[PDB]
């Protein structure tokens, strides 16, 4: 039934997932207990993609929650939608990663990786046909960049022909939250571009502005940012667990999207985003949902799509609609924006239509970008790496954990190899 | 006595077949349960207690669209052994429908085909519905047409492709999947029919005045073509053409076997009035460049062999009238070496309208199938959509990693450039 | 850049057929020679349908050269001397059955007839 | 009716049996008085395997309780389910074995053995057809190792065609409870490899971790460890006295499980083992009960089955289920673990299914192991025997009771003969 | 006037016989009391009052499985002198069921058989239901076939063995038992029918769509085969075949007398529709390599002799239609020295379905008994499982200690070595 395992790690991944399992349980009518109370059987025809049936009609999420300090795991266990999990899954250490890549990948990560994989191995056994692994982590924190990249390198030795999609949270350009997070991002891109088939890239700088401008909110708590992120996370797999006219999955959104095996960093986007009272001023039509999508003011990754060009584009729509409009609107926003799409990939917009709206809406669009627009996002972090490495400040908290000075010279040479390929295809033209 | 079976590979074939097998049950009075309150033995093998079941094989690689049929209105009709699924679909990947996944269950398909020929003494031919887009529709069909030509050989084989549109595209590697599947199907298929999605949107908007159709309303039109090609087997008319008679009257060379289709009349209920719809009129509805179902200009090429399939209440003197006026006209240019370009069937059945439909009730109809030089531009297009996506080696590593030669693509296009030149070879006229 | 099954065979010997610590000296006797052959495809010869490991081959497509690297058995086999076709499910870590009979790159292990052991 | 006689020697055996007859009596609806209060007659069709009917509808356990100090006997008699025993059976001396083998087998054991055997002779006369004798003793104490194997060598002179399954308790690797328990265990394996057909070896080290991790308990009393051992103790004879699809007695479990007349030291296992609250997060299926069994974290003998290889395996299921699933899962855990099973014993998984579950569940598995995995259990004791023999400490408490020094050299050469044969079949392969 | 009795050794025979004698009491209207609201004198010796009691001896060494029969639904039907029990089961030990425990009550069995032959004027044959695994079914039976061949000699003696599966095993010393119980039944039986469990689990899952069957739902399938061999002694057929006729048409050499049964149709209640089930169809269900109830490949070996046992509303022209198509086919290879390879039986009874059952109600059915070469591969397996255990002398000491020679095994394997070479002796074709 093409089951998906949902591994989480870090402080960011758990709080995303603690809203994400709140998000999925409304699409299937699951209470805080775990017993079904929905309406239609389409919630239960493909209920097994994210769940295991328990004795007595209960359901449990196929979720594996990993941390190194027990603070966040107690927080999810105390809140609502927290008792629904399996208590055998909450793997945690007693030390804390200490906002450190080396301590979460060499020192404390190498002692608590075994108790993780032995439950990952157990959750793979309950599956009939394993579709793949989705992982939710950071790239700036200590855990989600070190312990997260350990659970990919250990899994791809074990499940080499399975799709491995992380939904990382990229550090933001202007605001920060960590002094050494340029060091943590350079050490993870070495581990992500070789073992993950695709990686959705999310900023916070791009995510506050949508809460301010388009949503028209004044006080965005993280429970309202992750509330917005988890709409995209459900929107990708909703074509794998619902009937549609034209269908997609976690695999069709990997062959249609990644033209070269290194260039697989995606930038999401969602629409509609109304306000509390401004919902009654716009028309809820397929030509209206498209023009909200292809703006630069709705992309959740803080970069300009107008700088650089698209390579592939997926537009996973939802709700009931008409297939002529979708085949025309995607033509319409390719001809008027014919300098934004690349030349040597003709007709590059992968369409996917589900038949089921989100619970309460009428139609909605999940957008999956793939561009050269994220070439400066890696050019930015590689510049924040370069200044802090010439003075080699903050180095002794990494060197003292068994890490050599050559390893920073490798990944920065590796990241300039990534930037050189986006510049290679941005100017590559055919004759 | 002349039995014909139908395979539905891919998602495109099944939802077309949902529109198809709904339509035959409306013609013959067959309930969805299988009951009915004698010539229809070609598709419906009966049972001792009266419950007719279709001759269908719904093969897929993901179980998604099959489960809609197992829970739909026509659950009770089909034989539950027939519905073959898999676990992971090929997922827009030719290299997974022919080397990895479809290989695993190719024996489950052929064995169930083997248990359908044995009830048939007068086995007529095949009806494989597929697309060119997806990996299941193009990779598993290229596997299945290989196996049946080895198994049978003599039998007639008909495809109903969903050709990829020139301007609308719902996939990214869609020109990769066609060149791989055309290289394979060229020497095993025998008369493949081309239907686009884009040109039906032109018809559904203009001639029908529906601004918002669906695949549902695009498959009611392709159901009317398939019902009318096989309208001479299932019924009794003044002049009945056979499925073996199409592959003679339409194939001038063993390579060129791509006729495109056209149905007429396609008018709404409001425009069902205000005009008269004569046989002298509906024939001229077919030869327009705006009424085709493949986005090509027929005035840029030459018709090699037309084939009109009238039905309903048609008098054959008027067919002498409506045809003899046409090859006196100037713009419709046939081929100079072919002085005779028609093959006519007159049947005694009007086309039946499905309830909850969009088309009008008419008393006469025509399903023109026409072979022409004008599809050479539609093959000159995908070769231009091939060399751009291959000079950069785009999307190759998803194909190499499933048992494929990376030098096979240069060979497969080489067996398209020859087919590119053959339409131009035929289209010129050797004098003396 | 081509297709191989060396990370699958390395995964399969180390976890399903020679997993226990008894066969750990015997596992090193075979695994160290696998890193030297340049074959793209490999295939595992069992004894019974109970899939006990006894021999390892290397397979060359378009020639069907089934030369033997390690284990006990014949040097070369043909399509005449085959019984069943196995596939290593990385999901389950268990060799399943392929109902087909064509020896291709998705096929990971096989059994031969009982005549070749008497 | 194939009657079984239950002897209880030592302190530990009297405390397992004081819970064991509490365990049995809920499977037959027996009050503390001895009268019947159950519901189904299937409790009473084979009630006569363990019980002798008394006048007035009562039933007494066919049980014989042997000790030397009278302390534990009063604890059984004062506690509940104590008056149900026969007052003629409580045979005990007045000295106490003093945690000494030569005192309990030679000195004090040779003065109370005749008062024991005359009741053993009496209990056999009430039986129709005697099935065999089950014994419940330690291997570390003075009584259950000295008075216990005295009763075996007398009985096997008396009843040579009878199965004799002592359910011994083996000392633990890390924690101990007796300074001289390497001395008291090497002297008892000399008697047990020659006179008992099978001997279920049970540790305490592996038995706490099952109480700690799988059961999720904080303070496991002996009334919660012996509560777990007594579940296995009834489950061996759970199909000798209840109908089933496929049957097993104490004799079928002796022929299929014993390949050679010396290699007969077994090791138990049980499933399911839930928590108080985590009972509702797992599925209760036959493939779930199987994978719980074959872990190394559920074997009550403190040794790894992944060290060493299996020779034979029994699996005595209970409850109502389907015979296809069992015959497939026993095939399933043989193919993926074919390195763990030995090659020259083909299809070595004996199967048995009762029709009656434990009182309250739906299905349960009792497991019997037979492995070379206990080669280091004897290698550990024979090393602690050896190092305490070079300095010959604690010897005068044995020599002064009438024992020669040669007997220690004999039993040590006996046990290294046993370890050498487990090593012989672990490496012997056919061609 | 032709009476045939049935013995039930072991646990496997009694639980099969529970499924048997329940099924006959539905075919004839017999109550569980023996009452009924007459050609069934073959199995039911009646009483002066209205009551019919069976001709069955339920012998066992443990009293466990017998107490179900003495307390179940058919308590009143049987005769309480028949139900012979013992004290201790043979406990997966051939050397206990033949030298030690079975020797004790072998006289009470033969005395009770003696009182059942005396009510029979025209005594026909013997039926033994026994496994090969357990000690009773393989060790007490090998004593019992020895005794009745001395007591009677001339009468036909049929077994219905349970062959041990190539992949599923519920015992450990099970290849020790099957070698010893084949050394003895080879010369004192007549026609042992082979039935496996593993092949029925495939039939219970694929052809029936039941994921979780039981020994109950397996024994409903072996009851139908037994009720099809002996349905010609119990009804008025157009072409009846006797138990004295099966010994002649199927046994070309006195060593080779091991056929393997096959039943058809085996379909669920919902797939009872959707297909027509004529005798040109259900015949091809039998010769599949996927419907045989022994896990062997019939495409590896050769059928020496088939024996089709039709029943229901079957017409013997269509039988000639069904059989003549078969030995024109290429994959089915009859043996070259045998030009005739069939034996047909038509009876006028549809198969009767037990309530609370799983098989659907059909109006025609077929058992197929056939003596193929392909079981030589199944005998090649039990010599390979023998030599991996005897070479290490595993499990020998439980057999030596009950009256056995340590060299008696190597003598008994030498019997199986000669029996293995006899099938390959026959499967070759001596020309000229
Ligand atoms: C309302 C209800 O269904 O309660 C159950 C229950 O909640 C659970 C949690 C029980 C419970 O067991 C324990 O909590 C436990 C405590 C200490 C040590 C080991 C176990 C139960 O106490 C134990 C008890 O077991 C029995 O009744 C069996 O017959 C069992 N009996 C005893 O162990 C026993 C206990 C006290 C006095 C006398 C006997 C048994 C098992 C094998 C062989 C013979 C007997 C059961 C089903 C229950 C409770 C009451 C809560 C579980 O255990 C057993 C052995 O069944 C633990 O996981 C299982 C699953 C059960 O569902
Ligand atoms: N006319 C018509 N075209 C359809 C329909 N469904 C899909 N298509 C077309 O089919 C093509 C996509 O191929 P699919 O059949 O969906 O793919 P598939 O055969 O299932 O293959 P995979 O999903 O890759 O395994 C596109 O050109 C769609 O427009 C339908 O109902 N009608
Ligand atoms: N088909 C079928 N096989 C059964 C049944 N019961 C047991 N068997 C098979 O019989 C074999 C075991 O032999 P048993 O008959 O139980 O043993 P036994 O004859 O009683 O001999 P002992 O118990 O050793 O004295 C195994 O292969 C079982 O699968 C049943 O109801 N149906
Ligand atoms: N979107 C989002 N980002 C968060 C959340 N919590 C933390 N982050 C971001 O995660 C980063 C800090 O990493 P963190 O996961 O807490 O560290 P770790 O626990 O060592 O992996 C910062 O960039 C935070 O902005 C959250 O709930 N939502
Ligand atoms: N499982 C279990 N072990 C026990 C119990 N009581 C004592 N033991 C063990 O028995 C050993 C001591 O032997 P003991 O029987 O008291 O000495 P004896 O009376 O001279 O035979 C130690 O290993 C204790 O852990 C009990 O109730 N349960
Ligand atoms: Mg598909
Ligand atoms: Mg028995």
Author numbering:
A (entry chain S), D (entry chain U): 1 to 44, 47 to 360, 369 to 441
B (entry chain O), E (entry chain X): 1 to 37, 47 to 441
C (entry chain I): 1482 to 1599
From the paper:
Conversely, the HsCKK N-terminus closest to the CKK core forms a distinct interaction with β2-tubulin that was built into the atomic model, whereas density corresponding to its most N-terminal part was hardly visible on the surface of β2-tubulin. Furthermore, there is no clear contact between NgCKK and the β1-tubulin CTT. This is in contrast to HsCKK, where density corresponding to an additional ~5 residues of β-tubulin’s CTT were visualised in our structures (purple) contacting both the CKK core and its C-terminus. For example, HsCKK loop3 residues R1535 and R1528 contribute significantly to MT affinity. With the improved resolution of our current reconstructions, R1528 is observed extending close to α1-tubulin’s residues H393 on H11, whilst R1535 reaches to contact the β1-tubulin CTT (top). Intriguingly, however, the differences between HsCKK and NgCKK contacts are most striking on α-tubulin, with the HsCKK C-terminus/loop3 and loop8/N-terminus forming closer contacts with α1- and α2-tubulin, respectively, compared to NgCKK. 13-protofilament MTs usually have unskewed protofilaments, running straight along the MT wall, whereas HsCKK binding causes right-handed protofilament skew. However, when the models of individual protofilament from NgCKK and HsCKK structures are directly aligned, this produces only a small RMSD (<1 Å) along the whole protofilament, i.e. the structures of protofilaments from each reconstruction are essentially the same. This comparison shows that, rather than rearrangements within protofilaments, protofilament skew in HsCKK-bound MTs results from a tilt of whole protofilaments relative to the pseudo-helical axis. However, protofilaments in HsCKK-MTs are closer together, giving these MTs a ~4 Å smaller diameter than NgCKK MTs with the same protofilament number. In summary, relative to NgCKK, HsCKK induces small conformational changes in tubulin at its binding site which, in the context of whole MTs, induces protofilament tilt, shear, lateral compression and a reduction in MT diameter.
